[PDB]
Structure 1
Amino acid sequence: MISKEYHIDEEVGFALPNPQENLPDFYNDWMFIAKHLPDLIESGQLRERVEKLNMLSIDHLTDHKSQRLARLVLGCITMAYVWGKGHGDVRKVLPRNIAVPYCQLSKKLELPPILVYADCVLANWKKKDPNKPLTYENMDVLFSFRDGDCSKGFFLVSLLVEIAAASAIKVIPTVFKAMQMQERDTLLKALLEIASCLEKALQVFHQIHDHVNPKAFFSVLRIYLSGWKGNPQLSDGLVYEGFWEDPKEFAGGSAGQSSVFQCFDVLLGIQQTAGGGHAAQFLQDMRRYMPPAHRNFLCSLESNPSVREFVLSKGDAGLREAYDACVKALVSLRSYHLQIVTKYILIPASQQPGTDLMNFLKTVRSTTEKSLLK
């Protein structure tokens, strides 16, 4: 079994298990804004409301789940504040009453002060009926940006794919134990189980089409997920008033921030972070946007011996076939992600009166393809 210091759940993997819905009474003003963002943004009172807030201390957020919920709340409020209605009217300064606690909370949890995958996917969910299981139909997001933004579809299908891949994560100890104990059959069985889980996760990914519209995603939700690293809209970055004097650059939300998105490439010796190129640079940089325990987990995978070298060293077709089943499943996940970017970003952008993500993902897939053994 995996160590508890890495904070990986048996059921939900890297996702935050049963995350908190309500902050303590001290932070009701935060929850008031975050709960009614679709109304407050559209009616144009979001920015005024945030500007009229008091600066609240973070010290009454005691346990982890409360601190994580606050990050989700504050993060969503920040993106709403920065982008507004999402028509290129941009706030270059985040006010100190929201900025100081958000940055202090961000420092405490070891994350950048900006909405990340961990917030808006891994912590942004609840069961409807606790007695019923984890499916889209028994689930809901805590927070959304606008009405008809498809944040439920986008975030929950991402979360279900995250949870699907969790079935493989618990096999990882078996993979490393088998190698040190030279248990070839156990290793073979283990790799096949990883491939089966990654095959299943692709099927779970298909739900994206059922619950997300292309035009809605591109025009509405994409803008709210955008950050301010290399963005012309905030050239110099955002100002966190009363915390840093100069503006600071931080990247927006990305599937690259998912620990699952990276960990299997690490496990299988696919050197995605090698090359010296933009893609490798990106994947490495996004480990800082993961929770500390998860970026430590990716580190300990890298520190363990190579599964690829072990398979190659044995002159074993079955082990190679099983290894390739995992590689093949990842290739299918990259290809499918590419189909999503085409449908949800490229085509809606052409209908406007994209590419860097395609090229990024094509490199990621190409590195995965070239790691096949047969």
Structure 2
Amino acid sequence: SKEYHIDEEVGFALPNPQENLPDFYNDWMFIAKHLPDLIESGQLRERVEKLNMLSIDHLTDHKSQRLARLVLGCITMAYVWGKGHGDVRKVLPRNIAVPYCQLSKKLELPPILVYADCVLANWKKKDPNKPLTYENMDVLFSFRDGDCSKGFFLVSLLVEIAAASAIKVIPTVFKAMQMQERDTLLKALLEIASCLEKALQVFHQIHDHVNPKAFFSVLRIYLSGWKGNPQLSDGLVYEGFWEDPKEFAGGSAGQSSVFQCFDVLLGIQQTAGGGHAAQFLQDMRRYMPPAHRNFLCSLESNPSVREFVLSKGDAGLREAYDACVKALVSLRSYHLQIVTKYILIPASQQPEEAKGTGGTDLMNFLKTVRSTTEKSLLKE
């Protein structure tokens, strides 16, 4: 609905994101749109230090506030990581830390670039009378020339949007169950699986828009956070807002609400039996917009789809359920192949880790999540 801020077309993505700020903030917008040139020239920190503190008060509506979060988060990652080879700043200047943390407190997000910034709000249509396809879209911000951030973020978005075509169906699932409407339940489950299967096919475009070296040695550096990170082992000082430094985890698709939400729907015990996997995915919910965090706990308050299906001795209903689970398994198995190409192999070619968001061991995290999904199948 509108209380959960779910768009009928793009789901959890911010529909038609704002591309321009109020003239007042032109000195934010100039740095953010020139992070590649400004980083390469050793000038980015300077241009940021030369800024004046700006009030967040001329950011009147939600889309303005979301764009500014994106601006400031990207600037913050540029400031902290610099050229991306290990010369890092552990203090973020008040002229930026302060409106960043104010705007953040307002939107109930942490003061760091999150998935909802750099994917869900970091896009535009080129031509608005053409649909949501890669050739009709661009991102609004990048970090370095050749970082494949347009590829990574838009392919990420297009998989989101495809998967979000199944959110539509969730109220049908629970109404069907409450109304003991066997046939519509089953058709609804089959439709959710069709959407998750299409999402996998969209994922296949990753290879054309991202290459391994750029992802592993550049993009991944600028998405990284300061939680569990030796390079900023105590956190980052938000000068002029908080006294001590604070840890926050980097961007992660574990912050995506669509995939968490099909784990909840299908009763895959992703945030439960654990343990590292489940605690991580629970933590990442505090990096989601508040209404999206609240959709997820609302789903959890509904009766279990899994228990309903398990208890019915109905082989077609079990197949439809399994078809949804299987689709999550196929997505996650494909995803580990991508993690092999874009992380593990480049990692091997360097003069067992390489960590993962918030310090995690990432192969174990992803294999545990996949295994948990596979073992939710009712039949092999």
Q: TM-score range by the shorter chain?
A: over 0.9
- Cα distance, 1:135–1:193 mapped onto 2, change above 3 Å: same
Please state whether the residue corresponding to 1:246 is helix, strand or coil.
coil
Q: Deviations over 1:50-99 (max 9, x none)?
A: 10100111111110000000000000000000000001001010011100
CA contact (8 A) 1:23 1:66 kept: yes
Distance in 2, matches of 1:230 and 1:124, equals 26
Match of 2:192 in 1: 194
Distance in 2, matches of 1:349 and 1:313, equals 47
1:238 to 236, 259, 266: 236
Distance in 2, matches of 1:59 and 1:303, equals 37
Percent sequence identity over matched residues? 100
1:114 shift after superposition? 0.1
Please state whether the residue corresponding to 2:10 is helix, strand or coil.
coil
Distance in 1, matches of 2:202 and 2:82, equals 33
Distance in 2, matches of 1:138 and 1:211, equals 14
CA contact (8 A) 1:121 1:155 kept: yes
Please state whether the residue corresponding to 1:59 is helix, strand or coil.
helix
Please state whether the residue corresponding to 1:244 is helix, strand or coil.
coil
Q: Deviations over 1:13-65 (max 9, x none)?
A: 00000000000011000000001111000001110001010011111111000
Please state whether the residue corresponding to 1:122 is helix, strand or coil.
coil
CA contact (8 A) 1:157 1:207 kept: yes
Match of 2:134 in 1: 136
1:337 shift after superposition? 1.2
1:276 shift after superposition? 2.9
Distance in 2, matches of 1:259 and 1:352, equals 34
CA contact (8 A) 1:106 1:112 kept: yes
Match of 1:95 in 2: 93
1:111 to 109, 130, 143: 109
Distance in 1, matches of 2:240 and 2:176, equals 53
1:357 shift after superposition? 1.5
CA contact (8 A) 1:141 1:156 kept: yes
1:355 shift after superposition? 8.2
1:281 shift after superposition? 0.5
CA contact (8 A) 1:161 1:202 kept: yes
Please state whether the residue corresponding to 2:273 is helix, strand or coil.
coil
Match of 2:273 in 1: 275
Match of 2:51 in 1: 53
Q: Deviations over 1:255-311 (max 9, x none)?
A: 100001210000001110012311100000000000001000001000000000000
1:356 shift after superposition? 1.6
Over aligned residues, Cα RMSD in angstroms?
A: 0.9
1:4 shift after superposition? 1.2
Q: Deviations over 1:240-264 (max 9, x none)?
A: 0011110000000111000012100
1:358 shift after superposition? 1.5
Unaligned runs of at least 5 residues, structure 1: none
1:363 to 363, 368, 371: 368
Distance in 2, matches of 1:339 and 1:123, equals 27
1:365 shift after superposition? 0.5
CA contact (8 A) 1:164 1:201 kept: yes
Q: Deviations over 1:205-252 (max 9, x none)?
A: 000001100001111100000000000000000000011110000000
CA contact (8 A) 1:346 1:355 kept: no
1:43 to 32, 41, 49: 41
Q: Deviations over 1:297-340 (max 9, x none)?
A: 00100000000000011111000000000000000111111111
CA contact (8 A) 1:93 1:238 kept: yes
Please state whether the residue corresponding to 1:201 is helix, strand or coil.
helix
- Cα distance, 1:302–1:355 mapped onto 2, change above 3 Å: closer
Match of 2:286 in 1: 288
TM-score (structure 2 length as normaliser): 0.97
Please state whether the residue corresponding to 1:5 is helix, strand or coil.
coil
CA contact (8 A) 1:56 1:101 kept: yes
1:151 to 145, 149, 152: 149
Aligned pair count reads: 372
Distance in 1, matches of 2:319 and 2:259, equals 22
1:149 shift after superposition? 0.3
TM-score (structure 1 length as normaliser): 0.99
Distance in 2, matches of 1:336 and 1:108, equals 37
Distance in 2, matches of 1:356 and 1:202, equals 24
CA contact (8 A) 1:162 1:260 kept: yes
Q: Deviations over 1:118-165 (max 9, x none)?
A: 000000000011111100011000000000100011000000000000
Match of 1:175 in 2: 173
Distance in 2, matches of 1:178 and 1:358, equals 38
